[PDB]
Write a protein that binds this ligand. Structure first.
Ligand SMILES: [Zn+2]
Lengths: 56, 400, 50
């Protein structure tokens, strides 16, 4: 997941927010302040069935 | 299935042709626009049209790190010098955008406005992309670096510097910005609504589809490498383009040895002059057993010689003429001895037997096809005229 | 463009393939060469797998 600055179009980066943590642009003063809880979903793959059932 | 629905008319407006320009922001998704943003200055370089903007941005707002704004403001300009200051205030209250030209020819592109029952069209005088300027870092770097701190001929015609001088020769023309919310927009938008009736026959658009095709996709070559007299192998079913008819039959009759005329007009076209081609066929063919046969004298040019890889000999057409005479007098050549009848050898004569005839066992050759209905055409003088020809050639060969 | 009957006068043979050269008196052929195509992108895996 990548996120871009509306101010300058460049990718946004998280920083040590003063009260709440923060996305900030590396160059322009545009900033974004974390309000909500947020996650991204991976869902990795699992082992196949043949040798997981084979032989009990 | 017929054009049964939505038969909307079309209109064209020239009032804004030189004024229309198309601007887009690839970085700006369509879900919001810049209506709320005052553009504080606008500029154009009309010669080699290219555009620059300047606009304001809010600073008090929480998505603005005013501390960062101040810290970088002290850097992009001279910290306390402001020789060429881009922001008199110590905060980034403004931004600027640049533009990029999209094509060298806008003629094939036009703007279109849809209205119920009518479409209005107008060309575009230019299309430029738009870029957010990142140059403030560049001048911060320049500030830090400066704080830290006749003639011979050339082959530099393709220089960057030369085209930048050409670009710099044009000073920047400035404009006053007015947003889409201004009544100015509608006050001018009406100009594209061109006057006119609902529909009138166009002065243009007259050319036919075949004509439209030819000038749409013209020949890449304007002059042909060789003539249609067939200096090289050439089409036969696609009739020769401009060749005179008398020479067209000559071309056709060099291929096939004998041919009844009744199938020709399929090749030269039904519109062929029947009387003229009958006048021309006598020049190249002579009739035997109801069929027009190629003249030897045009089959062998004068300077010919025994072609086949056998006994060399000059252009002795007399013998081939004699076998034609045998076909004329008799029904068919039942006898082999026709070679020695005119004191020729086997190879000398065999090839012309296979020009028209086919073998029967121990009983010689007969034509491949029978006498056809040439008598259906009324010109009995032809058989007599050939008769005088047969008589003359007979008188010659009787000297043997 | 010659005819087989007048090949004999040049001492040449009607069937000879042609298409070769004569240099210093020894007949020589320029063999057809095979090249790989150019200006065409291709992706591949190195010996290391990358
Ligand atoms: Zn940014």
């Amino acid at each position: 997941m990548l996120l871009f600055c509306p101010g300058c179009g460049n990718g946004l980066i998280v920083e040590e927010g003063q009260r709440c943590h923060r996305f900030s642009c590396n160059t322009c003063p545009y900033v974004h302040n974390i309000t909500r809880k947020v996650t991204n979903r991976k869902y990795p793959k699992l082992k196949e069935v043949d040798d997981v059932l084979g032989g009990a | 299935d017929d054009p049964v629905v939505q038969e909307i008319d079309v209109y064209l407006a020239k009032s804004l042709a030189e004024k229309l320009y198309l601007f887009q922001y690839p970085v700006r998704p369509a879900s919001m626009t810049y209506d709320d943003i005052p553009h504080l200055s606008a500029k154009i370089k009309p010669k080699q049209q290219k555009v620059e903007l300047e606009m304001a941005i809010d600073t008090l707002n929480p998505n603005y790190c005013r501390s960062k704004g101040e810290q970088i403001a002290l850097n992009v300009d001279g910290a306390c010098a402001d020789e060429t200051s881009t922001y008199s205030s110590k905060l980034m209250d403004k931004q600027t955008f640049c533009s990029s030209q999209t094509t060298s020819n806008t003629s094939r592109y036009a703007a279109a406005l849809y209205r119920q029952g009518e479409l209005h069209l107008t060309p575009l005088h230019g299309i430029l992309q738009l870029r957010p300027s990142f140059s403030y870092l560049d001048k911060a770097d320049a500030k830090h670096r400066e704080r830290e701190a006749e003639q011979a001929r050339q082959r530099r015609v393709q220089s960057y510097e030369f085209l930048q001088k050409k670009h710099a020769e044009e000073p920047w023309v400035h404009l006053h910005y007015y947003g889409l919310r201004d009544s100015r927009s509608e006050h001018e938008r009406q100009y594209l609504l061109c006057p006119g009736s609902s529909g009138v026959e166009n002065t243009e658009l007259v050319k036919s589809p075949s004509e439209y095709l030819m000038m749409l996709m013209p020949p890449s070559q304007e002059e042909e490498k060789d003539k249609p007299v067939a200096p090289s192998n050439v089409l036969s079913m696609a009739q020769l383009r401009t060749l005179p008819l008398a020479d067209q039959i000559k071309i056709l009759m060099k291929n096939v040895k004998v041919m009844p005329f009744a199938n020709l007009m399929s090749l030269l076209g039904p519109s062929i002059d029947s009387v003229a081609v009958l006048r021309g066929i006598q020049k190249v063919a002579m009739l035997v057993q109801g069929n027009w046969v190629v003249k030897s004298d045009i089959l062998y040019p004068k300077d010919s010689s025994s072609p086949h890889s056998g006994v060399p000999a000059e252009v002795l057409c007399r013998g081939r003429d004699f076998v034609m005479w045998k076909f004329t007098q008799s029904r068919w050549v039942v006898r082999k001895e026709v070679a020695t009848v005119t004191k020729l050898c086997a190879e000398d004569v065999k090839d012309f037997l296979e020009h028209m005839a086919v073998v029967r066992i121990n009983k010689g050759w007969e034509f491949i096809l029978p006498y056809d209905g040439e008598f259906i055409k009324k010109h009995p003088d032809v058989v007599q005229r050939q008769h005088m020809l047969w008589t003359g050639i007979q008188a010659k060969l009787e000297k043997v | 463009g010659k005819t087989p009957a007048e090949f004999a006068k040049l001492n040449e043979c009607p069937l000879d393939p042609g298409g070769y050269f004569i240099v210093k008196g020894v007949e020589k052929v320029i063999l057809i060469q095979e090249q790989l195509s150019k200006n065409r992108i291709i992706v591949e895996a190195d010996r290391k797998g990358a």
